[PDB]
């Protein structure tokens, strides 16, 4: 008999786990418990801070919510107006010395006229081809060229996506992009070229909110805090080392054993196969493919430069910098960096030179957060990547050579992106149902490995819906039909459902 | 204060309401009650019997289930193996002296060769058009022609559907037919013609089950019996006469008032609007179109004739009979008609003449169930429709002139089919959200008026899902996404969910 | 017995008749003779002159030759280098205040951007339709819209062609435009728009040559002069009044009768039918359609204005002027108008004012030649057309209100354009075979009525090939296969053939 | 000074050369002369006879005339109605034990039904592809598959054309086949399959006429006989051994020298180059490809078998016989073989064995003419080809094993077919202009090497038109525009033209 017995055990306290925990707590029927090897919940949606006081998320994290349930839990966790800052979704592509507003193809009027000719000719070919197309594209690359034409594909989406996924576009599937037909909007693109028009895809109704304090990690600390503490085990005491699927028993690192009836596992599924000592499953999970994420943070002295402005996140297809995305993290919250009165010496200049004195000077400060991908097809020299990033900041005119850097941050995250390879679905259909038949719900960004439902809201809801399937026989819609949940407003499920209203009478 | 108060009131004890009640009963959370004006549950899924002992459903009723929950409840209600009979899904189209196996287009090799040429030529046009098509069809009629070509369309789907819907095919929408591309399988059709194939689309795979006793109606009597009797109110005592939406009160025939927090109404939504005395809603519901259904039943003396055989249901596009569909109802169960030793006189011969004797003679007996549609665009003379049907049976060679008729049956059902008109959705998206804002879930064949989710299993699950929305925040998939639920096996929701397992432990 | 007898008689000494005569003269086999009612040869390729010394062709006459034979005869007739002036084929379309270089669609960057957007959208539509086209266009109008798209059609080719043909574009055939597929060059059009580029379809190798003296009329006087004078009969003495097909006898106005074995008739085929007193042919030829041509000339004082420059001919789609084409005839040769020392009084200003002084002043002078069409669907007020043309010159900014007009010219030509109506070929293929059966070769712009082989070189060769068919059994390729002769340089037939070389030896 | 001087010299007295002779003789202008190394005119359109009295053409020779001029000369040469026999153009394809009427694809209803399905499926693919096609086929093979689909292509046109051309379909061009669109008549082909119908492409108005005596060779002997004898030189005395193009001198084998002004050469152009000792032209003409033709004749005892009947010529796609075509030559004329009264011994039985009796016996007799091709890509065993042919006749059921063979014939013609390779035109446009520059008109089947104008009538007119170009400046239409002359009735040029009529007056 194990030390502890619950109906439903949840492994992991990132968004997916916390989602399961929240729904279990709401339903208040089956017994449950949640464990995590980290003392601080949040997983990949956590936040670090440098010794100089600059915060960094695990890369650019912008919330877009497809679900009212997710909203409910965030509102409950951070109920005050001044718990949040609201920003428009402002983004650009760096290309040929220019900041080109998203969406890229609608804004190529910024490029030289000869580039415009190349871009439109390419898209004309794609339009005429789309007119007689009667097959869906098989790879990501085919999708891109059918959607954009050669010229435009080559300027942005092809080289950008290699820098992101650390595999060639030709190696990825394309179903994960949705059911929209791969064909260009020739008229829209040429109309903006003729008119000499730029138009970004944001405005007063395209916004996001970001926590006032603690970065993205502040959300999940606050959400976890609404759970009954005696049902959590966070830290070394909550680290899973063994999963005996046949016994329905989990062993923690300190020797604690937990018997369960149903298992919701949100750790990476390759890690779960190892913890299960299941050589068949280990074999299968090793066929999955993922990339690692290097997060680089740069803290900079000065009031925000005009060239930077209200920019939120930025894309970099070109090979004059190693990162694929930059985030002006200091724009998200004034508390992502020190106040202007805080004194800090200059660590280095952007040109790499190490400055005159050790004099601590005042602010204000601003902050850049960068992401570089790594995989077996794309190695990264960890010793030089910080310096290479900083030079990239100078090449892209984000920093002047003389800009003063007062803090740096670098951290490698092993599992960063679950890759939509051609082989992904074939491998998953061999893994997830096998786990299912042992009463294991493996779910999450790496729990079920599907990037298209891999955001904080998706993840949270994969946990919520797993519980709902376990308890109420609900359909796991986010897991099995990403196009369905991404194409609608999911308003039906709330943090207070009729069941709780009726019961409280 | 009302005579009775419940959390959830269900109006109607046809399949939809019984679905709602079964789910309420399983959850055993909020209090509830179900009412019906009829002492016998079942609605349009009920069964009548003639004084001579011939059973008739409300037209041809064949169950194809898309849901495990539905199967669960049927198994619970009729658990013995000999509660059911299994049959292959055998259907034909009557065309030009021929019984043509479904699907019609795959079996036109039974038609004269000159007409096969016309058909194939037409379908060749349709295939060539579909290759360059860049729009969806807008009407039922365009869908038919794109799928079949002109010639095949003119032989079956066009004239048949007018005889069913009692509106032209040009006046209906086609979204209700699902998302498959409107395009011909030219190779399948020509292959069968060239090979002279007459192959029906049924086998050991394609089966249905039918109750051993009581007709389709026996299913719903059995399901209803699993409900706690004291929470039911069936008969004149259960007739709703008034719905006060603003006070959330219902008033019955005898004067009983019932307060509710949430209402699930499965009566026809135009009757609901009148019962609400809501003038705006009355106006909107009068804009919905529907056809009435006449059910004619004929009991015949004799062992099953060879020409009839294992036939189950039959379509009639042609002009020599008033019915659109016939069912060999005596094939569905040997208890649908009297035993061989039962003695009955002959009422008439099929050509209308008087029998040589009025004495009672023994059987065996077989039985025919027919359907005739009625609408404002298509009157039906009640006084002659029985005789016209019987003449139809001679014209179609289902009966010889000499066949002895020992029982007849006719009944008119006012609300028969909810019509998928072009206007339907425009009207419905104004009705249902208004009822929704008053905590009224109007659901069912005429509760929500959508034929594509209008079968017994669909209806039952509309009730089930309305309750799941009310109590557990579930998405109403069957109501809002017909294509979704019809295109998959719906296995997650069971009559025993985790919720009940965990509680009983 | 008649007054004269020849093997081959040619009626008419325009380009077609002179072609017949040159070939007969070269062959020097059968006896022949040519007649015309005008003392001066040349027909519609003749030239008039005002009392003030301004020459005018019958509207814009620019030579492009498809034949080395035609070249030989022109070179023979005007053998000196200073008999000719060479120019680039410079043309523009007047549209919304602008002179738009031909071809129009390649130069719409000069229009407002909003209008460019509509043009390009229309041509995108046309390109996509062209990609799946499987039928030929049936009308001139369909051909135009399939080539340009709606927007560009409406700006130029639709309204311009009504002003030319004096019939709607929907009433004309399009086979006459040749075998090229009706499809747009979308890339060419969008490329020039994107580059803000203008580009005419002329250059150092896209030229024409014009006669130094006497205008186009000089060519045919010179050609005629190479014939044996006693085989010609020009003037009132050469006017044909009657043609007796059955006796093969022509009667002239002074009563002279001519016997022939074969007849080459280049008069308008509807005049020929009347001359034949053939009521059937009269009926048939009356079914043909043609428009009349008003030629208006304006002599202007002053050196060539900068705004005019090297412009040769000009198209006018718009409703602010009555002419469809303008020619800067003073650019074709310095001898088309008086020398600068010549003194002329000013007749009126361009705005209609009297001049300040009626004294004769010197030049230099320049000169504009205009064309206005007339038909039963488009009447022309003969009394006001000159003043209307001059007002039109101000509206289009060719003349300033102050410009001094010193000479005017107006002549109406009954048969100007033979119209490629839908009915043309149906009619012609009854007329020409009946004439052929009578040994009558009816050939020429109105002799055989096909505009696509209606230029000077075509006409000339129609007469040559008619002779060659009569004598040597040659195919009449220009007559029957316009696309053939227009699509190649016809080099085989020369003014000196092998027959004449071997003969002299 | 040479031994003889003429204006025009004609080398060769096959149909091309004789065409040039006949036209020069008609024109009666320049002096001329025609030479041939054979005493008997006709070239590849001549006829051999066996010692047993069986005639054989050089393979199947059936005349279809595109030209009135050709008809005139044939009529002149053989003016009596008993000089000719008329037959319907009856042909079949031998396929899977059956004689299938031409055209093959309209008659596949004769094949097994499963095979018909495969044929129709293939042609459906081809129809759907043709509907969106916007490129022209580049190879013979590509053309075939687009016209017929894969199934039908593999049954006949692909294997047949390899047996004919002795090169793969993938290595030949397809322009030579005309301008018709490469697309299937799906409706026609499926209609005949559905109706179970066969239909040949012959009847009362689809006939050919054949000479009563002397085989096809009798035409050209007779046509030659109408020429002035003194202007001809046929035999060893007329064999050309040297051409000196710079001297315009030809030397014959007996050392006679002829000077010319213009040369019409109808010998194979690769032989012409050698005779010119022009190393450059030799190099180029060696780039042309051609196949050799083996003619085999078999004379058979007995009246014409029922299985043979009215069959004229036959196609053999399959591997069980080496020949690609067979002609029932005894059907073309009763005088193509001995009369019944003629006594001949049996040489062998069709199974290859010795006859029972060696005694001469009577007829009647019939006769089969076979064609086998050969090239560097398809070698033929010359030593066994007769026996292999006769076994092929047994394999195809044209001959019974017991049939008695009374005469055999075999002859190899080195230059049999000028092959339409992909390279043909690139080479010819290097050859023909270079010869033209030297006043050499190289014309005819191997004179100018274009199979699409390589029949007797084409050849004859290539000679006629070359002369017409030389003397009257005519366009060489047959040479340069095969589609033009083949797509019309060429009626303008007659054996008596206007020139001769007017001269006789």
UniProtKB/Swiss-Prot annotation, chains A, B, C, D:
Catalytic activity reported: UDP-alpha-D-galactose = UDP-alpha-D-galactofuranose
Sequence positions that bind NADPH: 66, 89, 91, 102, 201, 313, 315, 417, 445, 455, 458
Keyword annotations of the record: Cell wall biogenesis/degradation, FAD, Flavoprotein, Isomerase, NAD, NADP, Nucleotide-binding
Keyword set includes Cell wall biogenesis/degradation: yes
Effect of residue 315 to A: Lowers the catalytic efficiency
GO BP field: cell wall organization
Entry-linked Gene3D superfamilies: FAD/NAD(P)-binding domain
Applied use: The UDP-galactopyranose mutase appears to be an appealing adjunct therapeutic target in combination with other drugs against A.fumigatus. Galactofuranose is absent in humans yet is an essential component of bacterial and fungal cell walls and a cell surface virulence factor in protozoan parasites. Thus, inhibition of galactofuranose biosynthesis is a valid strategy for developing new antimicrobials.
Annotated positions binding NADH: 66, 89, 91, 417, 445, 455
Residues annotated for FAD binding in this entry: 16, 36, 44, 59, 61, 240, 325, 445, 454-456, 459
Physiological role: UDP-galactopyranose mutase, key flavoenzyme of galactofuranose metabolism that catalyzes the 6-to-5 ring contraction of UDP-galactopyranose to UDP-galactofuranose, the donor used by various galacto-furanosyltransferases. Controls the biosynthesis of galactomannan and galactofuranose containing glycoconjugates. The flavin functions as nucleophile, forming a flavin-sugar adduct that facilitates galactose-ring opening and contraction.
Family according to the record: Belongs to the UDP-galactopyranose/dTDP-fucopyranose mutase family.
Subunit architecture: Homotetramer.
Protein known as: UDP-galactopyranose mutase
Organism: Aspergillus fumigatus
Designated gene of the protein: glfA
